[PDB]
Design a protein around this ligand. Structure first.
Ligand SMILES: *[C@@H]1O[C@H](CO)[C@@H](O[C@@H]2O[C@H](CO)[C@@H](O[C@@H]3O[C@H](CO[C@H]4O[C@H](CO)[C@@H](O)[C@H](O[C@H]5O[C@H](CO)[C@@H](O)[C@H](O)[C@@H]5O)[C@@H]4O)[C@@H](O)[C@H](O[C@H]4O[C@H](CO)[C@@H](O)[C@H](O)[C@@H]4O[C@H]4O[C@H](CO)[C@@H](O)[C@H](O)[C@@H]4O[C@H]4O[C@H](CO)[C@@H](O)[C@H](O)[C@@H]4O)[C@@H]3O)[C@H](O)[C@H]2NC(C)=O)[C@H](O)[C@H]1NC(C)=O
Ligand SMILES: *[C@@H]1O[C@H](CO)[C@@H](O[C@@H]2O[C@H](CO)[C@@H](O[C@@H]3O[C@H](CO[C@H]4O[C@H](CO)[C@@H](O)[C@H](O)[C@@H]4O)[C@@H](O)[C@H](O[C@H]4O[C@H](CO[C@H]5O[C@H](CO)[C@@H](O)[C@H](O)[C@@H]5O)[C@@H](O)[C@H](O[C@H]5O[C@H](CO)[C@@H](O)[C@H](O)[C@@H]5O)[C@@H]4O)[C@@H]3O)[C@H](O)[C@H]2NC(C)=O)[C@H](O)[C@H]1NC(C)=O
Ligand SMILES: *[C@@H]1O[C@H](CO)[C@@H](O[C@@H]2O[C@H](CO)[C@@H](O[C@@H]3O[C@H](CO[C@H]4O[C@H](CO)[C@@H](O)[C@H](O)[C@@H]4O)[C@@H](O)[C@H](O[C@H]4O[C@H](CO[C@H]5O[C@H](CO)[C@@H](O)[C@H](O)[C@@H]5O)[C@@H](O)[C@H](O[C@H]5O[C@H](CO)[C@@H](O)[C@H](O)[C@@H]5O)[C@@H]4O)[C@@H]3O)[C@H](O)[C@H]2NC(C)=O)[C@H](O)[C@H]1NC(C)=O
Ligand SMILES: *[C@@H]1O[C@H](CO)[C@@H](O[C@@H]2O[C@H](CO)[C@@H](O[C@@H]3O[C@H](CO[C@H]4O[C@H](CO)[C@@H](O)[C@H](O)[C@@H]4O)[C@@H](O)[C@H](O[C@H]4O[C@H](CO[C@H]5O[C@H](CO)[C@@H](O)[C@H](O)[C@@H]5O)[C@@H](O)[C@H](O[C@H]5O[C@H](CO)[C@@H](O)[C@H](O)[C@@H]5O)[C@@H]4O)[C@@H]3O)[C@H](O)[C@H]2NC(C)=O)[C@H](O)[C@H]1NC(C)=O
Ligand SMILES: *[C@@H]1O[C@H](CO)[C@@H](O[C@@H]2O[C@H](CO)[C@@H](O[C@@H]3O[C@H](CO[C@H]4O[C@H](CO[C@H]5O[C@H](CO)[C@@H](O)[C@H](O)[C@@H]5O)[C@@H](O)[C@H](O[C@H]5O[C@H](CO)[C@@H](O)[C@H](O)[C@@H]5O)[C@@H]4O)[C@@H](O)[C@H](O[C@H]4O[C@H](CO)[C@@H](O)[C@H](O)[C@@H]4O)[C@@H]3O)[C@H](O)[C@H]2NC(C)=O)[C@H](O)[C@H]1NC(C)=O
Ligand SMILES: *[C@@H]1O[C@H](CO)[C@@H](O[C@@H]2O[C@H](CO)[C@@H](O[C@@H]3O[C@H](CO[C@H]4O[C@H](CO[C@H]5O[C@H](CO)[C@@H](O)[C@H](O)[C@@H]5O)[C@@H](O)[C@H](O[C@H]5O[C@H](CO)[C@@H](O)[C@H](O)[C@@H]5O)[C@@H]4O)[C@@H](O)[C@H](O[C@H]4O[C@H](CO)[C@@H](O)[C@H](O)[C@@H]4O)[C@@H]3O)[C@H](O)[C@H]2NC(C)=O)[C@H](O)[C@H]1NC(C)=O
Ligand SMILES: *[C@@H]1O[C@H](CO)[C@@H](O[C@@H]2O[C@H](CO)[C@@H](O[C@@H]3O[C@H](CO[C@H]4O[C@H](CO[C@H]5O[C@H](CO)[C@@H](O)[C@H](O)[C@@H]5O)[C@@H](O)[C@H](O[C@H]5O[C@H](CO)[C@@H](O)[C@H](O)[C@@H]5O)[C@@H]4O)[C@@H](O)[C@H](O[C@H]4O[C@H](CO)[C@@H](O)[C@H](O)[C@@H]4O)[C@@H]3O)[C@H](O)[C@H]2NC(C)=O)[C@H](O)[C@H]1NC(C)=O
Ligand SMILES: *[C@@H]1O[C@H](CO)[C@@H](O[C@@H]2O[C@H](CO)[C@@H](O)[C@H](O)[C@H]2NC(C)=O)[C@H](O)[C@H]1NC(C)=O
Lengths: 339, 97, 194, 49, 49
């Protein structure tokens, strides 16, 4: 079971039991995160699109095929957007017979040939024109429709035909916020999933105050964001990832200490030192006088305490000089062997 | 002193043999003999020490301790007698050489 | 003359460099579990081997160290080389009067390989530096063994060894005489007055 | 010192080159396509890196 | 000796990685597709190896 702080290192490296030495560790966590969106100024205009499907059953055979199925977009056969924002759904009507007899039949969309997905169109995806339709037209991909009885036998019923063309004018929205004049959002102080001037990623956004004039985006030399700037003012913001890797030391099937970069306690360890370029977290004493592991400029001993490394003692006497004094000349000799 | 060679996995393994001092000895050194204040003698080779213990003069090396007796074939003439020399007259030169 | 004796150790992280902390890569890198398990150890083995050799030559002597003072060098003004004694800290000896002029030239322009501190790359409140910009990609630079102090204890123990003649326990011959013994090696000096 | 600097400056600069995929940022790949289609794209970057 | 062993252990382990093809074994490729279509797949492994 992957529950204990040490039981996770094995669970991460896919190994039953570990050797002695230093190991790298960075435990991620899957969760749900809020979403922020900042874009260049533009006005707001919205539209809504449904996608309904009603059915009836019971002709001669049930588990074979449904009797009839209807597909329509907003009641029409083709509807598309002259506006700047849109959002699409999918609705299956189960109150056709009053009593919900549709409990047995499952109907859902499949994955077609388009280079996107129906369920992820509401995200901040950008196009030029779309013009959905429910009839065949040349040059258009499609999403098939499926019907099944308790997941025994599958069949194809209909399809949804969609066109597009690359552009930067029409953007999808998760849901129609009403009463606003410029769609924007910003969540600070803990991890989010930002979409800022066509940049996507994760991190924490904090405020600051620096005196800089020029661009509205400071990227690194590897394509990642480091800080942007609100255009209607002078304040800037800072973006940093919220998961930093560490270094763990393993000795005799247990964790001795770690060298983190965050000023807090760690994976079962309590005490906290402060080295010149990082922090050290352990739970040992300070009375050890031995060494079992070695690192750049210090040696971690058995219980976790730090011990500095010492140089080697060696004494020598220089060459003799012509002088009227007292000298020292070797008298007896011994041998030794080196390899 | 010498060395020994033995083989190993795709290589060689040497076995050196060196010496190491254990005990030292204290010596009352000198720097040369100046006779009659003007004529002076010094040792030609720069690896010899002229010393004297309790009245007798001997010559040894500087790396090991191998005393022996001095001979006239080890001295050159270094005239004008630096001050920190041994004061001795020519009539008694045979007591050191 | 200048010689190079060591380089800087680099330790990299596989899962962070391959993708920036996405919790979905790790489900795909499991099929490559031996692809980068052989990289971290391949780097850390050489990084460990370097220190076992660099620290094996940097010895230290105590008696010869005490003779490195400027008062025991005759009339040869060598005071711009000897290490500085007191720094008002817990350091036996610091940089010399000449090393500072060397470090004022180049090492201040490296900006990405020397004495970086990782305690500040995790607080924000400013645009990230160049050194902290790489730490977000898993590249970490370990500290070296030869710091400012050990190099001032190994060099000072060699500069002070010249005046240490073959006298008794701790006597020091004048430096005007340490050259008379190094000139007789060439030819026997036959001049009474120097 | 210049040679030491250039080696890391070259290593950190190869994350910009997207291989034969949609984009060079994985959060964008997992934001557009579903789970069954993004696995054929992510490995194209993984093998290059 | 460890360094000598690791070099061959790394070389013999790169036959597992299938490139942008169907599988990492050529017999499987020729067992599924016809002759006119497997030639655009085999070369993707040949160039990598
Ligand atoms: C092409 O377009 C480019 C984009 O616009 C353009 O680059 C930009 O050039 C402008 C020049 O005006 C940069 O402006 C900044 O201005 C700051 C404000 O102070 C100055 O500007 C005021 C308005 O002009 C003046 O009034 C002001 O005088 C007043 O204030 C004085 C001080 O208080 C006072 O004494 C006076 O009496 C008066 O009251 C002043 O003149 C300024 O702070 C800022 O400083 C830069 O330079 C300093 C010295 O080098 C640095 O200390 C500082 O950190 C800034 O340098 C950074 O940027 C440099 C260039 O990129 C780098 O070389 C530096 O190393 C440093 O880079 C670090 O920091 C970056 C973030 O800032 C980071 O991204 C790096 O990775 C690195 O870590 C600066 O002068 C504007 O900043 C420039 N744009 C960018 C992005 O840098 C370019 O010039 C155009 N090309 C051509 C040919 O024209
Ligand atoms: C960028 O943002 C950051 C944060 O995001 C800003 O940092 C903060 O800046 C605030 C000021 O804008 C700081 O507020 C200080 O508050 C002190 C009192 O707080 C105590 O008491 C409260 C309860 O009342 C308590 O909650 C709190 O915790 C504290 O215990 C004030 O005393 C202080 O003012 C003092 O200093 C100013 C001028 O400061 C000068 O010197 C600074 C270095 O010491 C230097 O950094 C400054 O730039 C400046 O040169 C002075 O005016 C004050 O009073 C003087 O004048 C009166 C006459 O009016 C005179 O009678 C008196 O004798 C003094 O001569 C006083 O001495 C602050 O207001 C806050 O602490 C900061 N936060 C942090 C974490 O540092 C930052 O300012 C922003 N800007 C920049 C450019 O970075
Ligand atoms: C990494 O994180 C660690 C934390 O895990 C940091 O360690 C602490 O760092 C602090 C600052 O460097 C150390 O000082 C303490 O600061 C506390 C907060 O004060 C700051 O913040 C407030 C705003 O919240 C601000 O207004 C203020 O100006 C400061 O900036 C203080 O509360 C704390 O006081 C503690 O001690 C006093 C009594 O101390 C006196 O008496 C001692 C003998 O008893 C004597 O030895 C001391 O020297 C001193 O003379 C105590 O009264 C405080 O409150 C207790 O008592 C009241 C009732 O009396 C009770 O209500 C309350 O709950 C407490 O029980 C308090 O205990 C310090 O001044 C702090 O010491 C560090 N902690 C440790 C364990 O070392 C570290 O700094 C971080 N690293 C970096 C780089 O940032
Ligand atoms: C080269 O080598 C040769 C031989 O190999 C050296 O010759 C010998 O040099 C020795 C000097 O170290 C001589 O020993 C001294 O003997 C003195 C007595 O001699 C008198 O009596 C004899 C007859 O017995 C007579 O022939 C002679 O002419 C004299 O009249 C001692 O007094 C003297 O002791 C002195 O030093 C000790 C040192 O004690 C501690 O203190 C030091 C700090 O000051 C410390 O650093 C040391 O390490 C040490 O631990 C001191 O305690 C003595 O103090 C006594 O006297 C004071 C009054 O002055 C009194 O108050 C106190 O209570 C003590 O009672 C005293 O100052 C030496 O032991 C030896 O005789 C010589 N032998 C020959 C054959 O020549 C030559 O010196 C070497 N040259 C060089 C340059 O190294
Ligand atoms: C998916 O979509 C389809 C397509 O729309 C949909 O099918 C419609 O279903 C609705 C549901 O009720 C039907 O609505 C009814 O329409 C009646 C009018 O029917 C006309 O056509 C009759 C013949 O059509 C059948 O036969 C031909 C072959 O000949 C076949 O191809 C057809 O597919 C179909 O099976 C015809 O007999 C009928 O004539 C009547 O009316 C005239 C006067 O106009 C009279 O003189 C005749 O004697 C006869 O009575 C007519 O021409 C309509 O009458 C009916 O009325 C209901 O409501 C009133 C109240 O207003 C009640 O009083 C009455 O009793 C009825 O309950 C009702 O409106 C519609 O006709 C279907 N469409 C077609 C083309 O047939 C599916 O339902 C959709 N799926 C789901 C799950 O809903
Ligand atoms: C930092 O670390 C060091 C070392 O790691 C540490 O030193 C330890 O300190 C603790 C506590 O002070 C010591 O534990 C105590 O030991 C007491 C006895 O130790 C002395 O006596 C030893 C022999 O005694 C036995 O034999 C005689 C007969 O000969 C018999 O009468 C006695 O009853 C007893 O059976 C002696 O060997 C030992 O010497 C050690 O050190 C020297 C070098 O200095 C070395 O040469 C020796 O070989 C040996 O290693 C020492 O002189 C003991 O009485 C005492 O018992 C208390 O606790 C028990 C419960 O456990 C109670 O029941 C009892 O009533 C007492 O209250 C306790 O066990 C420990 O021995 C030290 N370790 C060493 C190696 O010296 C420091 O304390 C640490 N901290 C600091 C700040 O420095
Ligand atoms: C090469 O060799 C030289 C040899 O000279 C060496 O230089 C010496 O280095 C040592 C370092 O150990 C220096 O020793 C220091 O002495 C400090 C004392 O001097 C200060 O204090 C004087 C007053 O103290 C008197 O009164 C107190 C009681 O209040 C009493 O205890 C004292 O013993 C003493 O009697 C003060 O007069 C003096 O000022 C002099 O100099 C100024 C100019 O700077 C001049 O204007 C004055 O008129 C006066 O002449 C000076 O201010 C001492 O503080 C220091 O440390 C001690 O104190 C700390 C606590 O603070 C303790 O923790 C520590 O253990 C010490 O006890 C230290 O001992 C010595 O002064 C140097 N001498 C010279 C001439 O420079 C070089 O370093 C060598 N080089 C190398 C590379 O090794
Ligand atoms: C099984 O029964 C169904 C209906 O009971 C037959 O098919 C439908 O019959 C209705 C009669 O009201 C027509 O309105 C539909 O148009 C018919 N559907 C189709 C697709 O033709 C069917 O013929 C019977 N036999 C089978 C399925 O073998």
């Amino acid at each position: 079971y992957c529950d204990s702080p040490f039981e996770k290192l094995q669970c991460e490296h896919l190994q039953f039991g570990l050797q002695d030495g230093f190991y790298s560790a960075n435990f991620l966590d899957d969760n749900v995160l809020p979403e922020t969106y900042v874009a260049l100024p533009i006005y707001y205009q919205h539209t809504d699109i449904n996608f309904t499907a009603t059915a009836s059953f019971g002709g001669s055979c049930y588990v074979c095929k449904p009797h009839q199925v209807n597909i329509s977009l907003n009641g029409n056969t083709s509807v598309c957007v002259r506006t700047s924002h849109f959002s699409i759904r999918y609705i299956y009507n189960r109150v056709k017979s009053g009593s919900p007899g549709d409990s047995s039949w499952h109907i859902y969309l499949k994955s077609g040939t388009c280079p996107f997905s129906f369920s992820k169109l509401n995200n901040f995806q950008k196009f030029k024109t779309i013009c959905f339709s429910t009839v065949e037209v040349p040059g258009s991909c499609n999403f098939p429709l499926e019907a099944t009885w308790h997941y025994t036998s599958y069949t194809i019923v209909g399809a949804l035909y969609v066109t597009w063309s690359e552009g930067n004018s029409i953007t999808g929205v998760p849901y129609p916020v009403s009463g606003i004049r410029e769609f924007s959002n910003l969540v600070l102080n803990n991890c989010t999933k930002y979409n800022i001037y066509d940049y996507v990623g994760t991190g924490i956004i904090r405020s600051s105050n620096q005196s800089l004039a020029g661009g509205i985006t400071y990227v690194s030399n590897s394509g990642n964001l480091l800080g942007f700037k609100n255009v209607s003012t002078g304040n800037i913001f800072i973006v940093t990832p919220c998961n930093q890797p560490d270094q763990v030391a393993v000795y005799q099937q247990s964790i001795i200490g770690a060298m983190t970069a965050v000023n807090e306690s760690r994976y079962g360890l309590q005490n906290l030192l402060q080295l010149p370029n990082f922090y050290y977290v352990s739970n040992g004493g300070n009375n050890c006088t031995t060494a079992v592991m070695t690192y750049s400029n210090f040696g971690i001993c058995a219980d976790g305490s730090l011990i500095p490394v010492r140089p080697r003692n060696s004494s020598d006497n220089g060459i003799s000089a012509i002088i009227t004094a007292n000298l020292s000349i070797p008298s007896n000799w011994t041998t030794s062997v080196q390899v | 002193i010498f060395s020994i060679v033995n083989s190993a996995p795709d290589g060689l393994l040497f076995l050196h043999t060196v010496l190491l001092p254990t005990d030292y000895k204290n010596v009352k050194a000198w720097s040369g003999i100046c006779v009659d204040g003007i004529y002076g003698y010094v040792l030609r080779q720069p690896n010899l020490v002229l010393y004297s213990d309790n009245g007798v003069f001997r010559v040894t090396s500087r790396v090991m301790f191998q005393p022996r007796l001095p001979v006239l074939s080890d001295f050159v003439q270094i005239y004008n007698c630096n001050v920190t020399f041994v004061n001795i007259s020519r009539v008694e030169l045979h007591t050191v050489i | 003359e200048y010689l190079q004796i060591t380089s800087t150790p680099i330790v990299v992280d596989c899962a962070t460099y391959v993708c920036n902390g996405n919790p979905r890569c790790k489900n795909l890198l499991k099929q490559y579990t031996s692809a980068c398990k052989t990289i971290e150890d391949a780097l850390r083995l050489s990084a460990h081997l370097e220190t076992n050799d660099v620290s094996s030559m940097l010895t230290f002597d105590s008696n010869a160290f005490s003779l490195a003072n400027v008062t025991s060098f005759g009339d040869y003004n060598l005071s711009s080389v000897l290490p500085q004694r007191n720094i008002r800290s817990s350091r036996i000896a610091g940089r010399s009067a000449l090393e500072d002029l060397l470090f004022s030239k180049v090492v201040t322009s490296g900006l990405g390989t020397v004495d970086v501190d990782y305690k500040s790359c995790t607080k924000g409140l400013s645009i990230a530096d160049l050194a902290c910009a790489q730490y977000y990609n898993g590249i970490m630079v370990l500290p070296g063994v030869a710091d400012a102090e050990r190099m001032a204890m190994y060099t000072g123990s060699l500069i002070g060894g010249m005046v240490l003649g073959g006298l008794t326990s701790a006597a020091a011959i004048p430096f005007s005489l340490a050259l008379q013994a190094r000139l007789n090696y060439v030819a026997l000096q036959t001049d009474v007055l120097q | 010192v210049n040679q030491q600097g250039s080696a890391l400056n070259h290593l950190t600069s190869q994350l910009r080159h997207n291989f034969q995929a949609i984009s060079n940022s994985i959060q964008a790949i997992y934001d557009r396509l579903d789970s069954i289609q993004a696995d054929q794209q992510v490995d194209r970057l993984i093998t290059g890196r």
